[PDB]
Ligand SMILES: *[C@@H]1O[C@H](CO)[C@@H](O[C@@H]2O[C@H](CO)[C@@H](O[C@@H]3O[C@H](CO[C@H]4O[C@H](CO)[C@@H](O)[C@H](O[C@H]5O[C@H](CO)[C@@H](O)[C@H](O)[C@@H]5O[C@H]5O[C@H](CO)[C@@H](O)[C@H](O)[C@@H]5O)[C@@H]4O)[C@@H](O)[C@H](O)[C@@H]3O)[C@H](O)[C@H]2NC(C)=O)[C@H](O)[C@H]1NC(C)=O
Ligand SMILES: *[C@@H]1O[C@H](CO)[C@@H](O[C@@H]2O[C@H](CO)[C@@H](O)[C@H](O)[C@H]2NC(C)=O)[C@H](O)[C@H]1NC(C)=O
Ligand SMILES: *[C@@H]1O[C@H](CO)[C@@H](O[C@@H]2O[C@H](CO)[C@@H](O)[C@H](O)[C@H]2NC(C)=O)[C@H](O)[C@H]1NC(C)=O
Ligand SMILES: CCCCCCCCCCCCCCCC(=O)OC[C@@H](O)COP(=O)(O)O
Ligand SMILES: [Ca+2]
Ligand SMILES: [K+]
């Protein structure tokens with residue numbers, strides 16, 4: 056019980072923690088039915104609005120007014136934000152010339168620059184193009200500070216998963232807020248963006264910035280605002296907190312606006328009606344900046360202006376209905392809209408038939424505007440599977456569309472789609488002493504910001520999914536010095552120690568390498584295992600004696616490299632490898648015998664330097680288990696695409712290899728976790744194959760003679776026994792394989808998690824630059 060009879064006198068928006076039976080006067084109070092009886096009256100004044108007028112200057116203080124224009128308002132810290140402009144002849148901040156802030160200029164008592172995070176909901180990256188005509192304050196922040204052309208949100212591209220990702224540095228599958236709505240089958244309870252269940256702490260994992268701050272003795276303002284508190288009051292409150300005594304003043308502040316998301320939903324992102332909400336947000340940014348200038352803080356504070364996701368054109372007329380595909384949709388519950396998650400309506404309903412449902416949802420209309428996936432099959436870049444709150448059955452919905460359960464308008468915009476979709480990208484601007492001046496940076500992912508905010512506050516971040524150092528280039532100072540991970544396992548370098556006669560595998564056949572095929576140094580193995588370096592004319596590899604295949608195969612292909620064929624008499628040519636024991640080798644009998652599984656090669660014979668070399672490609676230590684379905688993809692990649700890349704990029708360095716992730720947690724499987732082997736054998740079957748293709752950013756220089764920055768694209772291709780994912784796969788590979796690959800684009804960092812390898816250890820670039828390179832995602836948008 057809360058004694059609501061107390062008073063919020065002298066307590067409005069107090070920062071001190073106050074639990075029952077004492078009544079409260081903060082933001083969460085309304086949400087908890089714990090506000091004191093005079094909270095609304097004392098703390099939410101509205102009288103006379105939010106702006107000083109000339110006729111109010113030097114007024115006598117009336118405590119009933121929303122903000123003040125009396126002579127004492129300054130030292131009391133509660134002037135209207137425009138007080139000085141109107142009453143003292145000052146200029147609005149936006150009207151002042153931009154000037155580099157080379158070190159913080161903070162008042163006496165400020166030990167470090169405060170951080171203010173200004174979050175805007177549904178702020179599409181492209182809205183910034185409206186510029187100073189619509190958003191003069193924001194445009195000044197953008198042009199004079201550090202800006203990205205866009206920031207990538209996490210999937211699903213909705214509010215709760217993204218705000219909490221911003222706060223934690225974690226993927227939703229890790230922090231637990233995997234949707235605006237979700238069902239937890241262990242709680243047997245349902246979370247919604249609106250309602251009280253979300254206030255229960257059991258939903259919220261990781262360690263959000265305010266807790267990290269607090270546990271390290273840095274004070275935080277609120278990271279929650281009751282919907283009923285107007286934006287102007289939120290701004291005045293932050294400014295009041297900044298005026299507090301040195302021993303009370305917080306170091307980090309958050310402001311949140313539910314616009315322009317609301318108007319985006321109503322009118323769509325390209326609507327003329329979007330101008331007004333964008334103007335209003337800009338006015339709010341102006342209030343804050345004018346307010347900060349009034350406090351002599353405008354060259355002291357670091358401001359982050361950041362969105363949660365973008366906004367797409369989505370109307371009633373573009374809705375797919377499951378009832379068109381499935382006979383009894385009343386027996387399933389669908390999380391619907393710009394994504395789909397399906398579970399039985401009755402939890403644990405034994406008649407639920409997911410394989411039948413998936414079959415009925417697969418490539419059933421030529422223009423089908425969604426695609427079903429079991430969650431383990433979703434692109435690995437989405438990192439959306441390792442959580443009990445994520446339904447096994449997912450629908451990835453095409454941009455501009457909705458999926459609904461059944462037919463049983465007032466919106467023109469929505470969001471939630473695949474986070475690489477252009478319309479879903481959002482905004483990032485950093486302004487203040489710690490950010491760079493007039494600097495543009497490449498787009499980056501929102502998971503990276505928590506580390507940077509910790510940097511801006513002198514905090515040590517909790518374990519998260521950012522790559523710390525990858526955003527050092529946004530910062531003038533306070534950068535984080537990364538350190539190379541230490542190699543755990545050193546390679547064996549086996550020479551010849553066997554003769555062909557030593558091998559009974561069932562197979563039949565009728566320097567200057569390390570320097571030239573490992574342009575960036577050998578990957579470091581970061582786990583305990585046993586493996587061999589193997590040199591060849593055309594390629595090098597780290598062959599695992601445990602997994603009976605290479606962890607990685609590395610080779611360079613010149614722009615003018617020639618593509619040869621595989622002679623008919625060598626079709627089935629597999630050769631034992633006299634450097635590796637028979638006992639540490641695969642055997643062809645297992646393949647001959649497995650009716651479903653074939654094999655492929657990591658270094659493609661098609662790219663051999665010479666027939667004497669080409670014969671090396673057929674070694675048993677270059678072979679990996681591949682389903683025929685996958686071979687269709689891999690052969691096209693090996694034969695057509697690698698050369699095509701080399702031609703377009705002026706040669707390419709390639710590293711390819713297997714990935715094992717049977718429990719879909721995005722991390723290298725240990726031996727015990729591998730669940731599939733080639734029939735009759737102990738040859739483990741990869742769940743995915745990766746390839747990392749590197750070249751010179753300056754395409755005028757060949758991959759192997761690159762003086763400066765690198766260019767990289769990578770993929771993590773699912774190793775599946777069919778091509779059901781690709782609706783056009785009955786056609787020639789040239790009509791569908793690249794499309795599949797684009798969907799499964801990946802960051803090098805993703806591959807590192809999944810393999811326990813560390814790449815790019817020997818280059819001429821800074822470690823920070825390499826970290827940026829490793830987080831890059833080639834999106835194909
Ligand atoms: C993204 O970055 C994160 C953060 O580093 C990585 O996630 C970590 O992975 C490691 C290694 O697999 C896990 O280690 C295990 O930890 C558990 C003990 O975990 C408990 O205690 C820790 C510490 O307080 C706590 O953070 C954990 O929180 C998990 O469980 C909570 C309670 O249900 C839940 O509220 C929270 O959301 C989180 O759930 C997530 O992780 C669990 C696995 O623990 C997973 O099943 C769930 O579906 C979510 O994904 C928990 O209370 C030990 O028993 C093990 O031996 C081992 O030490 C970490 O727990 C985990 N940390 C977090 C916060 O998720 C990701 O791997 C990384 N992803 C990629 C791709 O790189
Ligand atoms: C709930 O709050 C009210 C107001 O604070 C409490 O009222 C006070 O009670 C004490 C103890 O009897 C009196 O001495 C004061 O005169 C009261 N103050 C006022 C202004 O009414 C009340 O006690 C609280 N209820 C509880 C503790 O259960
Ligand atoms: C998958 O779709 C087929 C229709 O293509 C459904 O088949 C119907 O099944 C009902 C009873 O299950 C039969 O009475 C109808 O004759 C079938 N329709 C047609 C057009 O052949 C099937 O039910 C669907 N499966 C699921 C799980 O929804
Ligand atoms: C440190 C990391 C960044 C912290 C930033 C500030 C967080 C402020 C939280 C303010 C209160 C946040 C929750 C607001 C919920 C809300 O107002 O949703 C409006 C809905 O229409 C969104 O639905 P949708 O657009 O469909 O996802
Ligand atoms: Ca795993
Ligand atoms: K076979």
Ligand code: NA
Pocket residue numbers: 778779780781782783784785
């Ligand atoms: Na198909």
Ligand SMILES: [Zn+2]
Pocket residue numbers: 176177213214215316363364
């Ligand atoms: Zn949102």
Ligand SMILES: [Zn+2]
Pocket residue numbers: 177316317320470
């Ligand atoms: Zn929205």
